[PDB]
Paper text:
Transcription of pre-ribosomal RNA initiates by binding of RNA polymerase I (Pol I) to Rrn3, which stabilizes its monomeric form. Subsequently, Pol I and Rrn3 are recruited to the core promoter by the upstream activating factor (UAF), TATA-binding protein (TBP) and core factor to form the Pol I pre-initiation complex (PIC). Here, we present cryo-electron microscopy (cryo-EM) reconstructions of several Pol I ICs, including two CCs, two spontaneously formed OC intermediates and two OCs varying between 2.7 to 3.7 Å resolution. Together, the different reconstructions provide mechanistic insights into complex assembly, allow following template and non-template DNA strand paths, show the necessary conformational changes during promoter opening and reveal the interplay between Rrn3 and A49 tWH in promoter escape.
We obtained an independent reconstruction of the Pol I-Rrn3-DNA complex from the OC dataset lacking the CF where the A49 tWH is observed in the same position as in the Pol I EC complex. The movement of the A49 tWH towards the stalk appears to destabilize the interaction of Rrn3 with Pol I subunit A43 by pushing the Rrn3 N-terminal region away from the stalk. It was previously suggested that A49 is involved in the release of Rrn3 during the early phase of elongation. However, no mechanistic insight of how A49 could regulate the release of Rrn3 was available. Our results thus provide structural evidence that rationalize the previous observations on the role of the A49 tWH in promoter opening and Rrn3 dissociation. Further transition to the EC requires a slight movement of the upstream DNA that would collide with A49 tWH in the initiation position. As a result, the A49 tWH moves to its elongation position, where it displaces the N-terminal region of Rrn3 to further destabilize Rrn3 binding to Pol I.
Numbering used by the authors:
A (entry chain O): 48 to 248, 324 to 551, 581 to 614
B (entry chain B): 803 to 813, 819 to 917
C (entry chain D): 12 to 49, 80 to 100
D (entry chain G): 8 to 95, 99 to 174, 214 to 251
E (entry chain M): 179 to 403
F (entry chain F): 55 to 154
G (entry chain A): 344 to 406, 417 to 637
H (entry chain L): 28 to 70
Amino acid sequence: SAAMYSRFVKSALDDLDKNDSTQIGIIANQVALPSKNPERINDKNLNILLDILSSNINRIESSRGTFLIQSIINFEKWWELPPHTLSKYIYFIKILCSSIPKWWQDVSMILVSCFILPIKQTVCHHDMLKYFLRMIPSSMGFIDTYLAKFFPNKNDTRRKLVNYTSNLLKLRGYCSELGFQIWSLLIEKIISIDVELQNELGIKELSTKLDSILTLVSTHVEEQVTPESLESGEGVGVFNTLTTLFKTHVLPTYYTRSIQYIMFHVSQQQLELMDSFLVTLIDISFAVNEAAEKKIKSLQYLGSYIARAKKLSRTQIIFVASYLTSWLNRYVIEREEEVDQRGGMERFKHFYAAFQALCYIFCFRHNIFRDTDGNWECELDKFFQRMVISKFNPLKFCNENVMLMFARIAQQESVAYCFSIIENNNNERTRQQFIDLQSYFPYDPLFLKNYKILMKEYYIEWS
Amino acid sequence: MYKTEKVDLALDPITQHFGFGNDEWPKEWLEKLDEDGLPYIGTYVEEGDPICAYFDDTLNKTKIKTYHSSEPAYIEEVNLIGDESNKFQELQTVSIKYRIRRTPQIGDKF
Amino acid sequence: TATTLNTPVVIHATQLPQHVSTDEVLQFLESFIDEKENTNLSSSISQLKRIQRDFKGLP
Amino acid sequence: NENRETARFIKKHKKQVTNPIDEKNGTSNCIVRVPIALYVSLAPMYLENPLQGVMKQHLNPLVMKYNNKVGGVVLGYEGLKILDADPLDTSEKLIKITPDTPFGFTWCHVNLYVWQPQVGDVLEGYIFIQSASHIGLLIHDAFNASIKKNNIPVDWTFVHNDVELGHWVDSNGEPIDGKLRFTVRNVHTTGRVVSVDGTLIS
Amino acid sequence: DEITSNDRPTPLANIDATDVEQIYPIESIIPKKELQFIRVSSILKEADKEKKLELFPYQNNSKYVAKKLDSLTQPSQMTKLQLLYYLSLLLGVYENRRVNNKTKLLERLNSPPEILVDGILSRFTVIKPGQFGRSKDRSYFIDPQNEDKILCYILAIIMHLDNFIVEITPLAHELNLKPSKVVSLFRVLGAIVKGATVAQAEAFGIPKSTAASYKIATMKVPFKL
Amino acid sequence: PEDFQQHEQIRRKTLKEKAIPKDQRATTPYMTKYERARILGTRALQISMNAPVFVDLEGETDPLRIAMKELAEKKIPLVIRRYLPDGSFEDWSVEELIVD
Amino acid sequence: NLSRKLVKADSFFMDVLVVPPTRFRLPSKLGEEVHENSQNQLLSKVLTTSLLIRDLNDDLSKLRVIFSRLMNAFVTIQNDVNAFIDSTKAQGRTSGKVPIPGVKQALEKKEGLFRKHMMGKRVNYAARSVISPDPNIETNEIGVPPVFAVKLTYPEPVTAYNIAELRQAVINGPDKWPGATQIQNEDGSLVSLIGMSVEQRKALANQLLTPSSNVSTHTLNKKVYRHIKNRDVVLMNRQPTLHKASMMGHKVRVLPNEKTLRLHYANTGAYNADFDGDEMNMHF
Amino acid sequence: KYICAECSSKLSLSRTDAVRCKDCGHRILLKARTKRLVQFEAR
Amino acid sequence: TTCQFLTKAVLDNEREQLDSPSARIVVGKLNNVGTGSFDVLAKVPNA
Amino acid sequence: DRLLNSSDYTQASVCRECGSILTTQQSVPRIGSISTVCCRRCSMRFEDAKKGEKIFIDDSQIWEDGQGNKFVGGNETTTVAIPFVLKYLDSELSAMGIRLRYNVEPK
Amino acid sequence: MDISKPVGSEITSVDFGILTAKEIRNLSAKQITNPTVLDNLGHPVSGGLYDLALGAFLRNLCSTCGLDEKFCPGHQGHIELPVPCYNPLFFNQLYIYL
Ligand SMILES: [Zn+2]
Ligand SMILES: [Zn+2]
Ligand SMILES: [Zn+2]
């Protein structure tokens, strides 16, 4: 009957040139049933069909040829095949839609939507993709509405969603020179679980899914940024747009705390790539025509980027940030003749924060703040002494938690004297919500139990 | 002040029926309706509250007639009007009286 | 899409299409590309460096 | 009132530039420079660098596509001019702001490359990857082409695989290297990425 | 409002035959091509009504499909069983009159042949032309032309399956209509409404006391010229 | 291209012919109130669209109130046209205009 | 004449009477009875007068009183088009209280089309209210009830400038102290909050400042529509005024009290006001 | 619980009833109160 | 009399700059008889 | 903000070279076609595609209408800040017997 | 009117005209000649006074624009008179020129 089926599929293609075309549409209603039913198309009848249709294969594009292409590519759940039928069917994707941007456009609609599937079901879901990312230059046009399209929300069940978050690191690892598109969904969607998290600080579903992102993404991307690809591979191109992309989806949202852990882990592993991010924190707040609240948080990204870590060139921490200690000299020479003019005290958000952020280094690393000889680092007996009774009172408008850790170490280590001033504070002592930006510290202590696997590495306890 | 509302039905055999039939109407508005489809006497109507949840005939469903005014008031009287007719019909006209409790607030007139 | 913020409102041509040969623009596309790094600007770099090899290179 | 109206049939349908064969090397010349008066709208964020700030406004999302008025698939810009409303050259200059919104105007004219499709002209083909009801024809390895069943020759013939893309057989039976031929009959504008649709009788 | 002339939903009918069963063809309704593309060789392998109304594409709530299902169980009566799949789509468009696409409608019918579908959509629905459906399938709409166009395939089936009688109240009310809607609708093909005769009074179970209000509709001969 | 340039150099000469430079200035040289009812709010919705600011605002989260903190300080980058209503305009700027 | 157009007689004859579109003839339901547009009643008078005289050339050319079927109906063919436009002169109507208004009479009702639709428009974002006098207002404030401090909202963008006060509008919403009712996005969405909970009030305030997914709208930002403040202006004007100094703007301070509007003492000289029932508007 | 309006002739009628007062020919029917734990206003 | 003031207006077939606010706002435009009797230009740094 | 921004602002669309708002369309497109916006008055029917040889049409003027036909012409039209009442008006006065034309400033 | 939506053009002026038979060719989509507007049964008749080819009446799809009534303006139509008649507007002007 195999020779009886081969003439049943050869007598179809004739009479479309005789404008009858009888036996065409009968088969295409069979290739759309599920695999739940034995009366569909099977192994033997398809590869015989996919060669007899390929006799003179210029026979698709006519007025009747939309009903044929769809359900062949819509062979639903197409990973149920032995390795003999699997050959010519994958070849038929390589012949049907090799140049027409109309149904190959409906192929990457399938191959991206079938990346929600587990990785051992995607043995060829991305190897089909990687071949045309090195051969075809311009098939990037009609996939540019296919990345954020196939992001469902959490109304779908758990295992389809977060497995899709890992399936595109295979795909990006061979498509390296492009750089920026693949992130542009997964940069936005760190915030969406995080937005529903700090206002919850239905909540248990944020536990293991965040375990399914934090240990997942910050390990395989950590194996992307690697010392074996510093100056020979594509590693310099990684850093070029993971600063401005961090600047436009961590800085514009406030009180949203699970997102500053992207570059908090892969460049603390080394010496230079932290210091590549040490110049990143410099250029932000130090211009004129920038945003309004850019002076506070960006230099607050220097507070626990220095304190709670372990791998720092600490001979460079005083050296590179010497301009901020030279700011403290520049702030007292040129900029203390303006206070009795029109205005209050709150012109200087740069002053209660970056001075606080360097004093956020104070209570945590006191053995760094001493040398071998016996003096103080940069003469602490005058430098943090000159700023007491000036026209701002930097012991008046302060924080609660860290700015009242100023009471233990200042006396027993003989740092400062403010114990007769604390009673004198609360007599003299928009703007009502100005405290909302000056209360949160960026790199807080870690609360989770299974991402602490990665980040107890360069994180020390209180001493 | 009073606002005597009414309910007129379909401006043929009679095919509009007060009360409930046999479908399942969505509950939690037990709090205003007796099962005869007429409401209580003396409860606090708002906007977002049925008045005459009656049973249709064209789908055999229960439709619900909520409150079309602002006026958060109470509900007072229920009259039942039909036709004296020798081929007598089931009653199809209810004239329900409200009484709205008007405290003298500032901006009134003496 | 396709509004006044997405599309320029009125477009017209200045003059006749001053023509260049096919090999003429091979000297004059490099200034369109190399001024980039001193979504769409990602796909403005990789696909246009693969049409270099139409008349200049070979894969 | 018969012959007077009929003059406008051509001046809004004249082929602006037709092109003959090029160099006798298989290809043809349809890459060309056109200055155009791009009446653009501003970027109120970017009133400190409109040399870049309006370039990201209607010009980088203008690339690699076709339009209505230039009659060609635009490809690339050069020579950013911006124009003013004064007898002023000058470094700093004025922009007319809209009287309703910060999105201002400027009636600037800048100079564009464009690709154009002409009719009945030969064009290059590369064996890039071969299709089922298409022969693989990557014009400048960038955009795609199209054929039909009704415009293939007789000696053009096919063989499908036997042991383990698709074999094509010429007039005698030997495959060749990459260079292919294609002529133009029609165009199809409104896909996602544009392409042309032709015949092979030349 | 119709490619059929002048508001009557009657296609090319017949009044000029001799056979009783051949007074009106369903080829006027369902054409030759879709009528012969039914894999019908698996229906009467089973016999029980639980194993018949549970593998069809559509399952209704009422017995309005199966009100004549026991009148055909033998496979000698397969010609009207092709109409019983059409029974399964007699209501296949009107109780989903609100929605008018197809892939959402694919979850209404568990795997039917799509070639059986688009003879009703192309004529009896008024199409919304939209290419947002056309990559999938053919979207449509039902206008207010379509209220009395949707019953004549009961006046040639429910008439046809019981030797050409139709009673009012198991038809005017199982279709949820008032029995005065049909008197101005009886004469749209050539049907005749008539009272209670002397022999066929037992076909519903009525006495003679309401026989002037007991009104029947049937077909015996070709329509009176 | 043919009568495009008929509408390209008919405007570059009817802008010479309709202009008046600062030498033939004839209008009142004050920053007046309709001007003050204009260039604030013309910058104020412009500064609302994340436009750059030069002077440190005192946290005063109103788009209108920043520009009056600029108007009496003159870091206001706007230029005013003024119509003489029979086919001639006159130009100004804010650096050479002084406030009532 | 820059185009050099001939004038022709064919324009001054009515060949067509172009019929107005669907959206401009729409029959609504009003009263006990319902019937369609009174324009279509003029049109459906012409057609069956046209199509009566249209089908007479059948009765002469496909070959007496039959000639009077056209001439003494041409006086009604004349009377077709005119009463569509202008009904000053039609056949003698008895006192039936109304002849039908076609277009020009149907423009101007009590000669008020431009006077109520084109020029004198009915306006959104209003408030009509009874006035009250109250102190402690320096002649350009208006004390307002919170029920006008929750209804009339104000469009205002987010920036890297309006976050700290503006997230307070989002977290209240339409509940209380002025909040945020219709949050929009980079494309023009309408994300309401009139039923969204305080979980969705703390959520969206951590969301509002985000660059667009489409980089074709790369510069825009979301517009949090806050209600009203101590920092915006209410314009107010009296209805029968007949002078210039009546459209006097004021700012507003929220005033937790009953439901009326509070004029200041001294301001009654401009508006020619009483308090014997008189009451004036409020705009925004 | 439907008190008539003719002579307070108390009846408790259901649906599908022939409406008349039950001594003479009057139609109009009121409705009576039922105890409900409902919170009411007092200032 | 705008019924009768178009027999003297359409018949002439004029060109109106419609600059009075009884014609300026009927198309929707900023007024020449007030605080928008002109527009604003904008200084930009460089070409 | 008062007399135009009540609710009457829109981005109405005006065919230039005849000057109307009621005439243009957002046409129901072809199979792949997106944002098919054109006019009908400045266009003409493809049954009049005849004639110098016959010129090959350039596919930017083949576009499907609503009834199912195919006609050719009258392409470019932008969005103009117009009240709907004016868009009501130029069809109110077209019916009484006055033809109307508008124009714009960018040509 | 929102700041987030710009507009790239304006309106300058007005122009008048008078109805000629030449401009009836391309002004519409379908004739209107049948007298009544919709019969029984609820449908608006096609080629009718509430045609769908003249706008979109009563939540039907618009057979000119293909999308719903939230995006349909409604289109121009036209009668054809039996004889070309007067315009009583202009009866005060070309009475005398005649
Ligand atoms: Zn009694
Ligand atoms: Zn036009
Ligand atoms: Zn339409």
